[PDB]
Amino acid sequence: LVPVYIYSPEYVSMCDSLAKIPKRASMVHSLIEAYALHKQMRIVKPKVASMEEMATFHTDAYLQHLQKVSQEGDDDHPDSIEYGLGYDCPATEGIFDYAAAIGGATITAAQCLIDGMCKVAINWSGGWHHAKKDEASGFCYLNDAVLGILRLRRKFERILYVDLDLHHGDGVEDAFSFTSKVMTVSLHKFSPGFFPGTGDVSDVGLGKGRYYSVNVPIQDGIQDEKYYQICESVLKEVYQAFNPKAVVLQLGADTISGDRLGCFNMTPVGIGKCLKYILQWQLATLILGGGGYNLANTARCWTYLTGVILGKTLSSEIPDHEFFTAYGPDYVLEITPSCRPDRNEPHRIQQILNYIKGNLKHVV
Numbered sequence: 001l002v003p004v005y006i007y008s009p010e011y012v013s014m015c016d017s018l019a020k021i022p023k024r025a026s027m028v029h030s031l032i033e034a035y036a037l038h039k040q041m042r043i044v045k046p047k048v049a050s051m052e053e054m055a056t057f058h059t060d061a062y063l064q065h066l067q068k069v070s071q072e073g074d075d076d077h078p079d080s081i082e083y084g085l086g087y088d089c090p091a092t093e094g095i096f097d098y099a100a101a102i103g104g105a106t107i108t109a110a111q112c113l114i115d116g117m118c119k120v121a122i123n124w125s126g127g128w129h130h131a132k133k134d135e136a137s138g139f140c141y142l143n144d145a146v147l148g149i150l151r152l153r154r155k156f157e158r159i160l161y162v163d164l165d166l167h168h169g170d171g172v173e174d175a176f177s178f179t180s181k182v183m184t185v186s187l188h189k190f191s192p193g194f195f196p197g198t199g200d201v202s203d204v205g206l207g208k209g210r211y212y213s214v215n216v217p218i219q220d221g222i223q224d225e226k227y228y229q230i231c232e233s234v235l236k237e238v239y240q241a242f243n244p245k246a247v248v249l250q251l252g253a254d255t256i257s258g259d260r261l262g263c264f265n266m267t268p269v270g271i272g273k274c275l276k277y278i279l280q281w282q283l284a285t286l287i288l289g290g291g292g293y294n295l296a297n298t299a300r301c302w303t304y305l306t307g308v309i310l311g312k313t314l315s316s317e318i319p320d321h322e323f324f325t326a327y328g329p330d331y332v333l334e335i336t337p338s339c340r341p342d343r344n345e346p347h348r349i350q351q352i353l354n355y356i357k358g359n360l361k362h363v364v
């Protein structure tokens, strides 16, 4: 019953080097350990993914290119245009090893779930949901969520992927767009000019996977109570129509008030309610992180959610620890949203929910 916590010092040290989130993995782990939450979990060292494990989704040519430019960080290689490596996804030195470690961490969590070691396994440094089988994308060099789902498919016949990141989980949706055995549900900002431009409510999958992809397009300024209302309404229909046997849950914290992107107006309490609704299904659940560019707020969010997973209530006072000064000026766990307009007109929200309920009729 005790949740598995994927962690090692080597793993955190590698994840700390990712370009857009310097030291975020150490902050997340350090805050969790300062609340002593790791003492209530089964700590599991992640294995590094092998080439053949990564190739269950990614092409050998992509992985070999990534490995080659990773050796010295060749960010000027003429073939990188083939593979999505460039301004947004630079060929950092060591990026292949970091990708292999994150992929391996998510696979390890999936393996713990299928071995019955736990009902909940956590890889807070995972959630690289934009990566494609032969292209890096949106800071994602390897799609560890896809690798996790594929591992879970060795044992579980139907997997539900739920993506609460601010951005559409397009890489995961694409990987499974043509199958009814994996259903993807993404709540995300959908607006002209907002990356990656996909995931309208009319995108429902393709072929035999038609109606087994679900997209909930949301506008700026949504807050906890309406977001949870939307999420519960969709997930309730999904659970009834699809009958999942296992769940992969991406919890990117770029929805949280105070993020540099400043789109949604969420607090960890609202995401926590979504998490609780999924946990009460009592299915094997693989928990991933993702985006989150206010480093201290992301650590606030995921520490709180770790608390939710353990059924614990955490003290408001941020405990003294290595990154204590990042939590100023108030040094508390809670995040106060700002007072700004919610651009989600309730009639449009009901149109979207009705559309989705109609789509899920076609599902058995």
Ligand SMILES: Cn1cc(CNCC2CCN(c3ncc(C(=O)NO)cn3)CC2)c2ccccc21
Residues within 6 Å of the ligand: 088, 130, 137, 138, 139, 165, 166, 167, 193, 194, 195, 196, 197, 252, 254, 290, 291, 292
């Ligand atoms: C496909 N496509 C490509 C572009 C080019 N610019 C996009 C950059 C990509 C890189 N980037 C980016 N990546 C990941 C995240 C994240 O948190 N993902 O969960 C956030 N930000 C900034 C925006 C683009 C812009 C708008 C709409 C679609 C478009």
Ligand SMILES: [K+]
Residues within 6 Å of the ligand: 163, 164, 165, 166, 167, 168, 169, 186, 187, 188
């Ligand atoms: K999302």
Ligand SMILES: [K+]
Residues within 6 Å of the ligand: 176, 177, 178, 179, 180, 181, 182, 183, 184, 205, 209, 212, 213
């Ligand atoms: K699908």
Ligand SMILES: [Zn+2]
Residues within 6 Å of the ligand: 165, 166, 167, 252, 254, 290, 291, 292
């Ligand atoms: Zn994001």
